[PDB]
Design a protein around this ligand. Structure first.
Ligand code: HEM
Length: 184
């Protein structure tokens, strides 16, 4: 189960974060052991589509090849803290698993700037929940974490040395699909 109430960035700039562009996960920290594979790749696009806050997600296991996309409308809990009801889609936005109650994740932006971010997420999915997950994001694929986001990791009382890098997996990303999905 999840255990953390992540605190959102003071002065979080929502329009900058939710600008329709792509964020790549470069490093992640799962608090629960064996909650996720040790080799993984993920990215998301976050934007507003016809007035609604939206995220599109991409997950790829670089070993098993398991791949899936999701689209969510976000509801606001407070500035920088959201609840997202996801539907699983193909890369084109065709629905594979409909939105359903109990299938949701929370999403807190703990730090963000032009190029980087630190987020916390808590996934709830039927009988397949996920414990707390933190992720370092960058606008550039596989970019090394800069001093600002690393300092934010420290300020959150987390040890960056514990984060797992995604940069050494052979991962490729369909940016174009992620952007398109925002409207789906
Ligand atoms: C590298 C970082 C991440 C890893 C290693 C990871 C790992 C996983 C894994 C292994 C699953 C499979 C669950 C299953 O088999 O049903 C999953 C599902 C999911 N994750 Fe992640 N995840 C990451 C980042 C994220 C982020 C940043 C978000 C939200 C912004 C997110 C949201 C979700 C959602 C919504 C599902 C269920 C999708 C569906 O069933 O349609 N994940 N994740």
């Amino acid at each position: 189960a999840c255990t953390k109430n992540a605190i959102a960035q003071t002065g979080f700039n929502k329009d900058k974060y939710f600008n329709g562009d792509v964020w790549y996960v470069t490093d992640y920290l799962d608090l629960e052991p064996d909650d996720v594979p040790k080799r993984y790749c993920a990215a998301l696009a976050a934007g507003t589509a016809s007035g609604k806050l939206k995220e599109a997600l991409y997950h790829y296991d670089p070993k098993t090849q398991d791949t899936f996309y999701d689209v969510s409308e976000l509801q606001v809990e407070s500035l920088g803290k959201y609840t997202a009801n996801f539907k699983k889609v193909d890369k084109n936005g065709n629905v594979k698993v409909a939105v359903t109650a109990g299938n949701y994740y929370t999403f807190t932006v703990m730090y963000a700037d032009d190029s980087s971010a630190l987020i916390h997420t808590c996934l709830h999915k039927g009988n397949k929940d996920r414990g707390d997950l933190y992720a370092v994001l960058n606008r550039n694929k596989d970019a090394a974490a800069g001093d600002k986001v690393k300092s934010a990791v420290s300020a959150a009382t987390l040890e960056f040395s514990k984060f797992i890098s995604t940069k050494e997996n052979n991962c490729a990303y369909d940016n174009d699909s992620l952007k398109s999905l925002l409207t789906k």
